[PDB]
Write a protein that binds this DNA or RNA. Structure first.
Ligand code: MG
Ligand code: MG
Ligand code: MG
Length: 224
RNA sequence: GGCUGUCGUCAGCUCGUGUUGUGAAAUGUUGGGUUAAGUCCCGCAACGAGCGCAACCCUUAUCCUUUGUUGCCAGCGGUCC
């Protein structure tokens, strides 16, 4: 990827000076109208090694999971993962789903059972007293954990948009030695993650081109 | 030992894994509505489960089907009535 399209998306535009984390001193260019301007000359090579490691680990059948719960980016990341032969999560991250996988897999199994019940021609013999509420439980639970139903294991890498808002997940990432690739703007902590690509994390355009670059990266990785 | 009263038919009482704290412990069980109810919905470092609440049990109030004795007498005939 080149600087032109990411500049078009608005990567330089960031947050004001009242909410800047001093942990990212070299990740800044200057101040322009009471809002920080994120440096772009030092963000493309790091993104290059990030993509290189991503496709290197994807070429080895390395499953990765996509995290994003912003209301302006849930559908975009969901579609990117769907077209990116990987897994995704949209709603609130169930705390400890990694460190307590042996309990979440039971919910996965009961989701499969209820899915079979739904597509089994069975939800009509009920006396209209539980079918509707069971259906409601179905869409709630598929919105919750229906994106990793067939995942059946642990990831090798992990990719997050707007790392700060999903800090919880990153913690469980560091509890198990899973490398993390994430993008942090001017109000995040760059110590808990070893793959930093500074940029905006609020515009739909930003997440779209980031997901497109990730998708192309896994395309070229899988052809090895 | 067994059996019984009481708080009180009050709505509460706990467990597994995870996370937080040096620790006794906490969360889950907090918050906004709502109900007789820890009843339900939304949110949420919690995800699930159990005993409790409710339901399944008995009786009373309406209708239908099966049968008419020692129970019944609308329609007929007779009658010491
Ligand atoms: Mg401890
Ligand atoms: Mg002690
Ligand atoms: Mg407690």
């Amino acid at each position: 990827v080149s600087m032109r399209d990411m500049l078009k998306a608005g990567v330089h535009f960031g947050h004001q000076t009242r909410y800047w984390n001093p942990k990212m001193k070299p990740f800044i260019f200057g101040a322009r109208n009471k809002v920080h301007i994120i440096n772009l000359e030092k963000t493309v090579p790091m993104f290059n090694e990030a993509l290189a490691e991503l496709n290197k680990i994807a070429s080895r059948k390395g499953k990765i999971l996509f995290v994003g719960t912003k209301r302006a980016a849930s559908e975009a990341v969901k579609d990117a993962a769907l077209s990116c032969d990987q897994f995704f999560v949209n709603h609130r991250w169930l705390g400890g789903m990694l460190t307590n996988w042996k309990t979440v897999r039971q919910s996965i199994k009961r989701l499969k059972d209820l899915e079979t019940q739904s597509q089994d021609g069975t939800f009509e013999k009920l006396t209209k007293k539980e079918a509707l509420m069971r259906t409601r439980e179905l869409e709630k639970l598929e919105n919750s954990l229906g994106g990793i139903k067939d995942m059946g294991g642990l990831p090798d890498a992990l990719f997050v948009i707007d790392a700060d808002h999903e800090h919880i997940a990153i913690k469980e990432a560091n509890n198990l030695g899973i490398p993390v690739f994430a993008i942090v703007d001017t109000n995040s902590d760059p110590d808990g993650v070893d793959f930093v690509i500074p940029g905006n994390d609020d515009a739909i355009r930003a997440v779209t081109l980031y997901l497109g670059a990730v998708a192309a990266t896994v395309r070229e990785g899988r052809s090895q």
